[PDB]
Design a protein around this ligand. Structure first.
Ligand SMILES: [Zn+2]
Ligand SMILES: [Zn+2]
Lengths: 135, 4, 135, 4
């Protein structure tokens, strides 16, 4: 079929990702409006409302039934390229699509780096405190 | 909505 | 980077398939020229010069320096859709790309049916012969 | 060239 590292790229997989979504017809953020905005449902015990853009990897929760996933998406990560893409996936050029997947993989990397950075900082401050206590 |  | 089943669509990959291809500069069928025509090297013992179309899976051997791999592809298998692809690759469309990959998977299936038929007929010839010597 |  279509390689399953690349599926986030098509709405159908994205909606499919919403196994249980609190919001539904009558509400502005349905799994369809969500996917259409590039969100994925990555639920957990502590937060099973958690959605994440498949492109820029921004995560967010505490959704409200009247939030519109698109403006909620511009007002949080404005630099998302996916937002700039106004054409259906199938009408994308292989070059365009490849450029896109590039930028994605990069954004993934930046996210993981930011993460490692914070983790390290925390550990840094722990160790420092300890050694200060010993003073 | 709010950032994790 | 690209997903493995789909590499063959990429010229440089096809080219990279030619290892100890004897027809080198000066020749009409260079690995470059073969690739641009869709072939892949899949050499064996009896037939070290064996080349296969990736799209229609047609196979050809008995190569000679003057051979124009395009014109042999046209002559031997006229019906292959790859021959109709004028746009290189990355300027193609994802829609276009996946129609292509469908015909490819179809053609793949036609091929294994054909081989299955051939093994079948071989075995038949064997039992036939074997009944005759018993008659 | 010829078919296999
Ligand atoms: Zn995004
Ligand atoms: Zn062909």
């Amino acid at each position: 079929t279509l390689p399953p590292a690349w599926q986030p790229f098509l709405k159908d997989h994205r909606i499919s990702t919403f196994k249980n979504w609190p919001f539904l017809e009558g509400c502005a953020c349905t799994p369809e409006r969500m996917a259409e905005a590039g969100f994925i449902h990555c639920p957990t015990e502590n937060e099973p409302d958690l959605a994440q853009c498949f492109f820029c990897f921004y995560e967010l929760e505490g959704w409200e039934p009247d939030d519109d996933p698109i403006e909620e998406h511009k007002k949080w990560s404005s630099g998302c390229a996916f937002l700039s893409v106004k054409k259906q996936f199938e009408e994308l050029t292989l070059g365009e699509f490849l450029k896109l997947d590039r930028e994605r993989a990069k954004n993934k990397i930046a996210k993981e780096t930011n993460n490692k950075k914070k983790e390290f900082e925390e550990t840094a401050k722990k160790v420092r405190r300890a050694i200060e206590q010993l003073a | 909505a709010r950032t994790k």
